[PDB]
Amino acid sequence: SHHWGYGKHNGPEHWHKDFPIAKGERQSPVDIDTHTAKYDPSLKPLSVSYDQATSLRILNNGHAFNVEFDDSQDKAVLKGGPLDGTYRLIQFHFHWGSLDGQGSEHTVDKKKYAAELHLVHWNTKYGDFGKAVQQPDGLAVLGIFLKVGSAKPGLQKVVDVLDSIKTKGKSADFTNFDPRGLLPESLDYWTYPGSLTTPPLLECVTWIVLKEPISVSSEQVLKFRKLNFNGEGEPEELMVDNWRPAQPLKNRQIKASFK
């Protein structure tokens, strides 16, 4: 059964024993060295088209919480930038720390943010998510850093439902949530080819990491940290530090959309 996690005994340093691609050639996350990333004029404009997004449910899966979308039609898609074709939004989730000084998966010149949002999309040419994760261009994940400062108004409906999904396996209705309220003003980004950052660690992802972080309040991220990795009735293990550290860049280049 899967028993990977983020503790000492089942965390990122152990994952390779059951998921040997953990030591692969295009693992994520990575450190983004901003001086080494090169501006790429070939990049087409990035198009985040979430007008018709239809959120359904929020789930504590024992590793993070996912806000799930109806991905049965092109209702919420990502296109442009480095991407060929159309990528459909299926879910978003976060990674965060025990303290404000850590939590992000990607780093920027070795700087760790308090958290990182992942909007996960699959390439519609492959028909379903499960087929998409058999392809090197199957997925696109839009990554957004969170820093602690002013509250993010569009995040509060997420924060407020977390009390209802404290433990692993719980879910709640989560309709009519607009993910556009989680974006920063600018869509300036870095991009590189990588992987899922959790097991199974599949090398299918075009990463698009926005340069501009969003600000969330301390009270908002503190409510993340009250979630549990454990199931109901089990000894409490706070859901914190559910991030993988940066992995070797190997034979990759990170491209910037901006000067």
Ligand X SMILES: CCOC(=O)CCc1ccc(S(N)(=O)=O)cc1
Annotated binding site: 93, 95, 118, 197-198
Judge whether 106 counts as a catalytic residue: no
Give the residue closest to Zn ion by C-beta.
118
Q: What is the rounded CA–CA span in Å between residue 115 and residue 117?
A: 7
Specify whether the CB–CB gap between 65 and 57 falls below 8 A: no
Which of the ranges 2-10, 15-23, 115-123, 173-181 carries the binding residues for Zn ion, by CB under 5 A? Answer: 115-123
DSSP letter string, 22-72 = GGSSS-S--EE-TTTSEE-TTPEEEEEE-TT--EEEEEE-SSSEEEEE--S
Site string for ligand X, 139-168 (x = CB under 6 A): --x---------------------------
Question: Is residue 197 within the footprint of ligand X (CB under 6 A)?
Answer: yes
Question: Is residue 120 within the footprint of ligand X (CB under 6 A)?
Answer: yes
Q: Which residues contact 231 (CB under 8 A, 6 or more apart)?
A: 62, 167, 168, 169
Site string for Zn ion, 127-156 (x = CB under 5 A): ------------------------------
Shortest distance (Å) from residue 81 CB to ligand X: 17
For residue 17, give the 3-state DSSP assignment. Answer: helix
Shortest distance (Å) from residue 35 CB to ligand X: 26
Question: Is residue 1 within the footprint of ligand X (CB under 6 A)?
Answer: no
Which of the ranges 32-40, 158-166, 191-199, 219-227 carries the binding residues for ligand X, by CB under 6 A? Answer: 191-199
For 146-155, b where at least 16 C-beta lie within 10 A, e where not — what string? bbbeeebebb
Question: Is residue 14 within the footprint of ligand X (CB under 6 A)?
Answer: yes
Answer for which of 79, 88, 106, 118 binds ligand X (CB under 6 A) is 118
Q: Which residues does the annotation place in the binding site for Zn(2+)?
A: 93, 95, 118
Question: Is residue 43 within the footprint of ligand X (CB under 6 A)?
Answer: no
Q: What is the 3-state secondary structure (H, E, C) of 120-169?
A: EEEEHHHCCHHHHCCCCCCEEEEEEEEEECCCCHHHHHHHHHHHHHCCCC
Q: What is the rounded CA–CA span in Å between residue 62 and residue 32?
A: 28
Question: Is residue 118 within the footprint of Zn ion (CB under 5 A)?
Answer: yes
Strand pairing class (38-39; 255-256): parallel
Joined together, the tokens standing for residue 214 give: 């969003």
Which of the ranges 25-33, 118-126, 170-178, 186-194 carries the binding residues for Zn ion, by CB under 5 A? Answer: 118-126
Q: Which of 3, 63, 106, 121 is catalytic?
A: 63
Answer for which of 10, 49, 102, 135 binds ligand X (CB under 6 A) is 10
Shorter beta-carbon distance to ligand X: residue 56 or 133: 133
Catalytic residues: 63
